[PDB]
Design an enzyme around this catalytic site. Structure first.
Site, PDB file in Angstrom:
ATOM      1  N   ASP A   1       0.825  -1.208   0.000  1.00  0.00           N
ATOM      2  CA  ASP A   1       0.000   0.000   0.000  1.00  0.00           C
ATOM      3  C   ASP A   1       0.864   1.265   0.000  1.00  0.00           C
ATOM      4  O   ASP A   1       0.636   2.214   0.739  1.00  0.00           O
ATOM      5  CB  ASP A   1      -0.961  -0.016   1.196  1.00  0.00           C
TER       6      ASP A   1
ATOM      7  N   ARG B   1       0.088   9.140   1.192  1.00  0.00           N
ATOM      8  CA  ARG B   1      -0.672   9.153   2.445  1.00  0.00           C
ATOM      9  C   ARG B   1      -0.086   8.170   3.449  1.00  0.00           C
ATOM     10  O   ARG B   1      -0.349   8.269   4.637  1.00  0.00           O
ATOM     11  CB  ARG B   1      -2.146   8.817   2.202  1.00  0.00           C
ATOM     12  N   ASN B   2       0.720   7.226   2.973  1.00  0.00           N
ATOM     13  CA  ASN B   2       1.338   6.260   3.873  1.00  0.00           C
ATOM     14  C   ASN B   2       2.839   6.465   4.022  1.00  0.00           C
ATOM     15  O   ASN B   2       3.564   5.564   4.434  1.00  0.00           O
ATOM     16  CB  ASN B   2       1.039   4.837   3.406  1.00  0.00           C
TER      17      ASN B   2
ATOM     18  N   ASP C   1       4.862   1.230   7.919  1.00  0.00           N
ATOM     19  CA  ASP C   1       5.580  -0.011   8.098  1.00  0.00           C
ATOM     20  C   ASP C   1       4.642  -1.154   8.546  1.00  0.00           C
ATOM     21  O   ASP C   1       5.107  -2.222   8.927  1.00  0.00           O
ATOM     22  CB  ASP C   1       6.635   0.256   9.199  1.00  0.00           C
TER      23      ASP C   1
END
Ligand SMILES: COc1cc(O)c(C=O)cc1-c1c[nH]c2ncc(-c3cncc(C(=O)N(C)C)c3)cc12
Ligand SMILES: COc1cc(O)c(C=O)cc1-c1c[nH]c2ncc(-c3cncc(C(=O)N(C)C)c3)cc12
Lengths: 269, 267
Positions: free
Chosen positions: A132, A136-137, A150
Site C-alpha cells: 500500500d 498518504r502512507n 511499516d
C-alpha cells in the site's frame, strides 16, 4: 519480544491522530522520556487480534532510517498497543499539498524519492512487500526526513507472488494491473505503486488519473495508457516512472536499481 | 433474556442453511438493521435443551466464537439469532478455496483463531464436544469462528459424562470418550488435532477408508494418521501431541494457541 514489551502505564495518550484516517492511532507520551510517540490501539474489531499482534511481530525485525521505528509493544493483556516513533509533520500527501514550494523544491523532491526508494530497497532485500505504497502512507519529520509506514508488511521471497484474499478492495489508482485482475502482489507491484507515488511527489500531491472513472482504469492500462509527465518533472524521473509502470511485472526495475538512479540524481543535484 | 429477547416478527425468515446439514437453521434478515442473520428454530429436540444452549450463549463473548444477537423464548416457534458468516462452513470453504490465496500462512492463521476460541473456553470451564471443520465458520478476510451451540459447563469438572445412549462422530472422538462417554477439554484437544488434519488436507475425510468398528482398537494399538503432504513437521508434531492416548499428556489450548501464534507470526 520480551525486550520489546512495555507496561501500558509507561504510556499516556495525548491526542487521537489522523484525524481518524489511519484508525485507532494516537499521539501519546512515553512518560519516562518525555517523548511524544505514536500509539496504535485495537478497538473491538476493527482489526482481528492476531492480525494486530503479527503487525507488531514483523516490525521488531525492521531496522532502517526510512522505515517507521518500533519503540515497544503491549501484548500481555488488552488493551494492546503498538508504540512507534512520532513523525512530527504527519503524512507526506498533506505535507506536499500544504508546503512552501520555494523550500520544498526540486532538490527536496529528489531527496524524498531517494529516501523512500532506500526503504523499499531494504524491504526488497529483507524480503517483505508493502502492498500500500502511496504518499498518504509516508510520514514526514523535520528537515524533509521521510519514513515509509511499516504496518501492513508481509513476508514474501522476492521471486514469489502473494494472492490477496477474495473480495479484497484496492486503492485502484495505485494498484498494479496483475493485482487488479488476479489479486496478485509482489515486490514488482510495489514498484508499480512507487511509480504512482513518484507522480504524487512530482505534482505536490495531486490525485492520480484526474477525472478518470475508476472502473475504466484497468482497461486503459491494458491499452498502454499512462499518466502524462507532470509539469516541471525532469525527463529522467518521468522515464523512471514509466519504467515502474511496465505491463509485465518482470520488466519493471528493482528498488536497488531505482534507489541507485535517485541517489545519483540527488548527488548530482 | 431481557436484553436478548426479540419479537419473532423482527425477522424475515429465508432459505434453510447449508444444504440442511445443521439442520433446522435458516438464513434470515433482521429488518431493522438490514442485517442478514442465522436463525435456529424449534417448532415444538428437547425444549429445555434449546433453552439451556440459549442461556449459555448469553455468557460467551469471543471474537472467534459465533456471536449471539438475539433470542425468542416467549412462545413457539423458538428462535435463537446469531451473526451470519458469509463464507459458510470451514470444511466446504477449504475444499473450494484457491490454495494460492489460502496457503500455508493462512492455514496457520485459522488454527490460531480456533485455538484462541478454545483457550477462552478452557479458561472459562466450558467444553465444546463437537470440534470439526464442519462446525467452524468463515467470514471475510480469512476470519474464522467456532460454532458454540451445545457448549457444556463443567459445574464440578473437569470431566463431563454424556447422556445414555449418546452417539458421537467416531473419527473426531477421543478414545476415552468412545470408551466411557467421558468428555473434557482434553477430549476437545484430541478433536482439535483431527481438525488440524482437516485443515492441512484442505478438507479431506479423516482416516479415509478405515472401518469405523476398527478405529478404537487401531488407536489403542497406536495407529495415528500420517503427516499430510505439505504439512510442516512442527504442525504435525502438535497433531500427534493432541492425539496422546493419555488425556493428561495432551497439551492445553493455552500451549497450542501459543505454538500456532508463534508459527503464524514467523510466517
Ligand atoms: C500513517 O501513520 C501511521 C499509521 C499507522 O497505522 C500506525 C500504527 C502509526 C502511524 C504513525 C507512526 N508514526 C506517526 N507519526 C505521525 C502520524 C500523523 C499522521 N497524520 C497526522 C498527524 C498529526 O495529527 N500531527 C502531526 C499533529 C500525525 C502518524 C504516525
Ligand atoms: C455451523 O453453523 C451453525 C450451526 C448451528 O447449529 C447453528 C444454530 C447456527 C450456525 C450458524 C451461525 N451462523 C452461521 N453462518 C453461516 C452458516 C452457513 C454454513 N454453511 C453454509 C452456509 C450458506 O448457505 N452460505 C454461506 C450461502 C451458511 C451457518 C451459521
Amino acid at each position: 519480544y520480551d525486550k520489546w514489551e512495555m507496561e501500558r502505564t509507561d504510556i499516556t495518550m495525548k491526542h487521537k491522530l489522523g484525524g481518524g484516517q489511519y484508525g485507532e492511532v494516537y499521539e501519546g507520551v512515553w512518560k519516562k522520556y518525555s517523548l511524544t510517540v505514536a500509539v496504535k490501539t485495537l478497538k473491538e474489531d476493527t482489526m482481528e487480534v492476531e492480525e494486530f499482534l503479527k503487525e507488531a511481530a514483523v516490525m521488531k525485525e525492521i531496522k532502517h532510517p526510512n522505515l517507521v521505528q518500533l519503540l515497544g509493544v503491549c501484548t500481555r493483556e488488552p488493551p494492546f498497543y503498538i508504540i512507534t516513533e512520532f513523525m512530527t509533520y504527519g503524512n507526506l500527501l498533506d505535507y506536499l499539498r500544504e508546503c512552501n514550494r520555494q523550500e520544498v523544491n526540486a532538490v527536496v523532491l529528489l531527496y524524498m524519492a531517494t529516501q523512500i526508494s532506500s526503504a523499499m530497497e531494504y524491504l526488497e532485500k529483507k524480503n517483505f512487500i508493502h502492498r500500500d505504497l502511496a504518499a498518504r502512507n509516508c510520514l514526514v519529520g523535520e528537515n524533509h526526513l521521510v519514513k515509509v509506514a511499516d504496518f501492513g508488511l508481509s513476508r514474501l521471497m522476492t521471486g514469489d507472488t502473494y494472492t490477496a484474499h477474495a473480495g479484497a478492495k484496492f486503492p485502484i489508482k495505485w494498484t498494479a494491473p496483475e493485482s487488479l485482475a488476479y489479486n496478485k502482489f509482489s515486490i514488482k507491484s510495489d514498484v508499480w505503486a512507487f511509480g504512482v507515488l513518484l507522480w504524487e511527489i512530482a505534482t505536490y500531491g495531486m490525485s492520480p488519473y484526474p477525472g478518470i472513472d475508476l472502473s475504466q482504469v484497468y482497461e486503459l492500462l491494458e491499452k498502454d495508457y499512462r499518466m502524462e509527465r507532470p509539469e516541471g518533472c525532469p525527463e529522467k524521473v518521468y522515464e523512471l516512472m514509466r519504467a515502474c509502470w511496465q505491463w509485465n511485472p518482470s520488466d519493471r526495475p528493482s528498488f536497488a536499481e531505482i534507489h541507485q538512479a535517485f541517489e545519483t540524481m540527488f548527488q548530482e543535484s
